[PDB]
Amino acid sequence: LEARAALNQALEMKRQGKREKAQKLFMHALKMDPDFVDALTEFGIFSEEDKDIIQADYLYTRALTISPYHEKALVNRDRTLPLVEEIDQRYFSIIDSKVKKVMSIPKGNSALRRVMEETYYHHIYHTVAIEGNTLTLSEIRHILETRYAVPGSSLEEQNEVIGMHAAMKYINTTLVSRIGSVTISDVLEIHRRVLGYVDPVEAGRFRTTQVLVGHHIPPHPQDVEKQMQEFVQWLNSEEAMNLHPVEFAALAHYKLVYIHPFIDGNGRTSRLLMNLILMQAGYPPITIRKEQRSDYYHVLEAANEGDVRPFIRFIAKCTETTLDTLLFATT
Amino acid sequence: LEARAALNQALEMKRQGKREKAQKLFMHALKMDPDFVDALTEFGIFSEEDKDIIQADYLYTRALTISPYHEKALVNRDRTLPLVEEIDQRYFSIIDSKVKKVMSIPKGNSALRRVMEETYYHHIYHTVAIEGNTLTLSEIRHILETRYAVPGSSLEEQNEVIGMHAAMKYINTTLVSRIGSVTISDVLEIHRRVLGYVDPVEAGRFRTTQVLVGHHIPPHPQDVEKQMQEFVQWLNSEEAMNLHPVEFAALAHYKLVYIHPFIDGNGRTSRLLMNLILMQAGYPPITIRKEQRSDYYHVLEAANEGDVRPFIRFIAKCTETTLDTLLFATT
Ligand SMILES: [Mg+2]
Ligand SMILES: [Mg+2]
């Protein structure tokens, strides 16, 4: 048991007062056994000493999903759960007050006008770049302003960009202002534009083949439609409307990605649905940056393994970064 | 009546023995009055002297569609109608025997192999060039071989080309060899690929707005579906199967263009349907050349004004040119 060995080194290393070695030893131990209950528990206690309550609670919560009767994780989780709820609520309150300031700024303001036009091309850049698109911000600007092809670049990559433009224009023209319930048709019409210029056969229609997505196996094609019916019901439900808008938008994003209803364009379509929910709640649209790709996939994995909270927190931080930029620009 | 004046000059000019002036004077007169019964009749008699029986009969036939009791057109038409039927049949027999020779040539032949690969890119070039696409044969070859964009050319123009490639590949993979009836779905699946990369919203769905096409007003959108049902019924009918394949393929082309079922891609889709019918009858695919555009539109106009025979003859000549090239190349 190299797992059981690595932990005892980590605990010894902590006792001595070497945080950095202990840190790595805890990580090494959980790489060797990701379901190692005592390693999660002891790394949690360690994290609380650095004042990282959220991480400690994530670890205790994970431990219990494996061994729900582990006494040391249970006693600790019972303390941290209500505490982390309060910390998470307090962060939503900081976001709420930062949105109030941004909502207040006069609509004509020359600074706010400049920022919003840049973030349009910026959103297209990052949302395609995240899927492996190699086009630059300026190349994307050239494609959308002139409608002419960029030299020595794949037509497919350029068609992903005009697809994103057509989808966002459709959302802003037809959906953002529309009052009433979201429909499966709304999602199909978004996808039709996202993927239409790349794969017109598959655009606007459900995946017909089972796939692997990282370590995720999504619903079988035969179940995709019913899962999407249950999803849009949730989008229109009472409990969804009573969530904080950032949590509602984050969970809508995660649920759609989990279902993976299309052969491709699931990520791009989910990030558009997120921004529709946020904008309908009077939030600004947010952009998960190309550089955040690895963090993005890590919090999706944590959600798949049973805890969606790090994903929600990740979307909350993206939402705060977006607001900070707008406030800064108009201050 | 400048019409009545121009004719009398033409007749006088013919009496004297000046064919060229008379020719132009007859044309000038029919420009001024396209329904001028005596001008059509007298130009017909003139055409018979040059041994142009087909033109003379076209003119007599046109005269009678205006004035069905004009005695001089009627006596002439009654003579030329059965004669032109025989001449048209004899041309179909020359085409039939030229197809027999081409069908015979060994399938492995290195010369036949070379020709057919060139005509693929050649077909895409002419079918898009006819619709106003400014891309060159080599630019089209670069787009389809590399999938990379050509410098300083519109994405739309390049997407028309990958659409044509996807449609032709689909036809050859799924339709050409398939046995049984053609369906409306087959036509929608062709259109889905033809227009999918340019207009994914409209690809594979019937026109929802009334349009003008030259001087042609097609069926109103509310009638498009029923007209397409009647059209595919005709495609699968007994009378269609008993037509000469060239006449069947030409009339299928004309009927679909007349209905104009889509917002765009009607021409490209009709030329594909023509080549599917020809190839299923063991004919080679044909290409209406960019340079023939004006002749093409002239015979479509003659069909709209009540005589489809010049259109059928035009497709027959295109079919003979195609065969002559193949025979030449392998001789
Ligand atoms: Mg590049
Ligand atoms: Mg050019």
Numbering used by the authors:
A (entry chain A), B (entry chain A): 104 to 434
Q: What did the study's authors say about this model?
A:
A single ER‐localised Fic protein, FICD (HYPE), catalyses both AMPylation and deAMPylation of BiP. FICD is a class II Fic protein (with its αinh N‐terminal to its Fic domain) and an ER‐localised type II, single‐pass transmembrane protein, with a short cytoplasmic portion and a large luminal‐facing catalytic domain (Worby et al, 2009; Bunney et al, 2014). We report on the transition of FICD from a dimeric enzyme, that deAMPylates BiP, to a monomer with potent AMPylation activity. Mechanistically, monomerisation relieves a repressive effect allosterically propagated from the dimer interface to the inhibitory Glu234, thereby permitting AMPylation‐competent binding of MgATP.
The crystal structure of dimeric FICD suggests the existence of a hydrogen‐bond network, involving the side chains of Lys256 and Glu242, linking the dimer interface with the enzyme's active site, impinging on the AMPylation‐inhibiting Glu234. To test this notion, we mutated both putative dimer relay residues. d values under 400 nM (and EV1D and E). In vitro, both mutants established a pool of modified BiP. De‐repression of AMPylation by these dimer relay mutations was also evidenced by enhanced BiP‐dependent AMP production, relative to wild‐type FICD, whilst possessing similar deAMPylation activities. Combining the Lys256Ser and the monomerising Leu258Asp mutations (FICDK256S‐L258D) further enhanced the BiP‐AMP pool produced in vitro, an observation only partially attributable to the concomitant decrease in deAMPylation rate. These observations suggest that residues connecting the dimer interface and the active site contribute to repression of AMPylation and that mutating these residues uncouples a gain‐of‐AMPylation activity from the oligomeric state of FICD. Mutation of the dimer relay residue Lys256 does not result in large conformational changes in FICD. Moreover, with the exception of direct hydrogen bonds to mutated Lys256 side chains, in all FICD crystals the putative dimer relay hydrogen‐bond network was maintained. Note that FICDK256A is more stable than FICDK256S but less than wild‐type FICD.
